[model samples]
Target: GSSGSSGSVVAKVKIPEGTILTMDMLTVKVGEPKGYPPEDIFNLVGKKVLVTVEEDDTIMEELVDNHGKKIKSSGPSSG
Candidate 1:
């Protein structure tokens, strides 16, 4: 019984701090350092990361600085 897709994703590369997340950074894995609340890579792009995400790890929402943090509006880096 294996047929379908899940929203869960992971970083298969060494994503350093301040590194702009792109397409290739999206992958699937397990484990996280702090809480490790798995998040989708969809809202990850066009943004920057606060911490360094190593391979076989998940991206936490708190550490992701979706640019400026004006999530209230449509603009990502609205500063």
Candidate 2:
């Protein structure tokens, strides 16, 4: 569908579902060109995002350190 396009669902980082979203889990991304997020970032914290894109849903993401570092990377779900 249209989700395969560029800059869909703006966010600070790609967080996975079925997990607790803390303050660090959400990031406000501006200037998005396509696709909307499942929900807002700030309000989404401390809540679990339950929307399933399709089947076999899972996309692991990374957390950034203070020095602009990324850690705990996982496989991407989409192309």
Candidate 3:
């Protein structure tokens, strides 16, 4: 789950273990300042998201509320 932005939208995301996060990928999905008007909404199609797998092979998805609370598995992303 992405950190709450504008205090309204929620983004639900899932990533595999040991994923590599790149600036280019962040901009595509989250819209970098240079993405003015954006070339495409699906820019993050092949980019990896920020997430790391635990020893239990459990892929965790963070949940963030409007109040910036990580609610285990509650918050999701808004498109």
Candidate 4:
């Protein structure tokens, strides 16, 4: 039998630090952590990770920068 309740977010693959989260870096899992909810995962996109995330590992807020502190998606940098 399956509970199918709700869970946390997981990284589809290994994510490195300073990595900007995008549509492909995330996936929904079955059960959440203490305070993390399913909806919180969606908010992770466009944000920069503060720590490395292993493949199939949980994507928690502690691994990312604070709210509004994400790396900006801009054009190539200049010298």
lDDT of each: 0.65, 0.38, 0.31, 0.73
Comparing 3 and 4 on lDDT, the stronger one: 4
Candidate 3 Cα outliers beyond 4 Å, as residue runs = 1-11, 18-39, 52-79
lDDT of 3 by residue, 30-73 (tens): 32222222333233333333554222222112311133336576
Clash numbers, per candidate? 1, 0, 7, 5
Better of 3 and 4 by TM-score: 4
Which parts of model 2 are misplaced by more than 4 Å? Answer: 1-11, 32-41, 51-79
Rank by TM-score, highest first: 4, 1, 2, 3
**Error of model 1, residue 4, in angstroms:** 7.6
Residue pair clashes in candidate 1:
10-27
Candidate 3 TM-score over all chains jointly = 0.21
Runs of candidate 4 exceeding 4 Å displacement:
1-4, 32-35, 69-79
Q: Write the per-residue lDDT of candidate 2 for residues 21-41, one digit (tens) a residue.
A: 555543333334333333443
Tell me each candidate's TM-score.
0.59, 0.33, 0.21, 0.68
Candidate 1 lDDT tens digits, 1-79: 6633443456768799989888687665442223332344556776788899887566767667756666576754544
